[PDB]
Each structure stands twice: as structure tokens, then as C-alpha cells.
Amino acid sequence: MALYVSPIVSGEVIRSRGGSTSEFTPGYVKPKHEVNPQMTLRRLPDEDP
């Protein structure tokens, strides 16, 4: 707010604004899967007999 100081004495120095930072760095994901070559011997639920 702009103060109502009288125009005789002085005016206060309003502190300047600005400045705020933060970091959100790493992140990751890796969903590994296998193949297990021994499951292909049996039949899938599809692929009618």
C-alpha cells in the first residue's frame, strides 16, 4: 500500500521484490520383462487347437 507520508519529513525505502527458485531434478522408470523361451512350447489361450 502507498503510505500517506507528509511531504515535509521523508519517505521510506520500499524493499524491492523478486527471487524464488527450486529444483525438481531426477526422475526415472524402467519396466523390464523376460521372454523365458520355455513358455512357447505350450499353446496360448488364442490360436485355436
Binding site: 523390464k32 523376460e34 496360448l44 489361450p45
Partner: protein, 109 residues
């Protein structure tokens, strides 16, 4: 009516290599695949893990065999799932069941 679910069969839990080895065995009864083994304290002949002697795990059996088998082939590395490996009912608390293979290349996920 009846349902027969076709589920896959993956004993490994990680991509780490699963080596194997052979050693003389002293089994007393039929032991299916993935039955933990312990080393006997009298003659040091491999037997099935009792589930009570803590820290006695030495390996996991890979091929089915009975008391007639002179040599047993067991894994000595890799990572295995809890739900796939057959552990004896003597060990009842899950925490001690998990860390039974610590100190050896075999791990449980």
C-alpha cells in the same frame, strides 16, 4: 463350466545370471525343484534344508531327485521369486524366510 487358467512359469525374478553346480547329496526323501539345501554337520553331505537351522542355506535345487541320487545339481546364484520356490513349513515368519540366502549369490525377490 470348468476353467483351466494358462499361467506362465518364471522362477527367476531378475535378469542376473543363474549359474549351477553339482555336489554329492544325502537326501532322505523326494525333493522337487526349488527345494533349499543345507550342508550336513556330520559328513558334510548335502541334504534338504530343515527350515530351522538359521544361516544353513547353501543352494536351491534345480532338478528333481530322490534319495537314490548320488549327485545333486543346484543353483548357486541369481534371483528367485518367493511365490515360485518351495520352502519348508518349519520356517513360519516371512522376515527370516527372506534373508535366509544372504551371504550367498542367491537372492529372493
Amino acid at each position: 463350466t470348468s476353467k483351466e487358467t494358462f499361467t506362465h512359469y518364471q522362477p527367476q525374478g531378475n535378469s542376473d545370471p543363474a549359474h549351477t553346480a553339482t555336489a554329492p547329496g544325502g537326501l532322505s526323501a523326494k525333493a522337487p525343484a526349488m527345494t533349499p539345501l543345507m550342508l550336513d554337520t556330520s559328513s558334510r553331505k548335502l541334504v534338504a534344508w530343515d527350515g530351522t537351522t538359521d544361516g544353513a542355506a547353501v543352494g536351491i535345487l534345480a532338478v528333481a531327485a530322490d534319495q537314490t541320487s548320488t549327485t545333486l545339481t543346484f543353483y548357486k546364484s541369481g534371483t528367485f521369486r518367493y511365490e515360485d520356490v518351495l520352502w519348508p513349513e518349519a520356517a513360519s515368519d516371512e522376515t527370516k524366510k527372506r534373508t535366509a540366502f544372504a551371504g550367498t549369490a542367491i537372492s529372493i525377490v
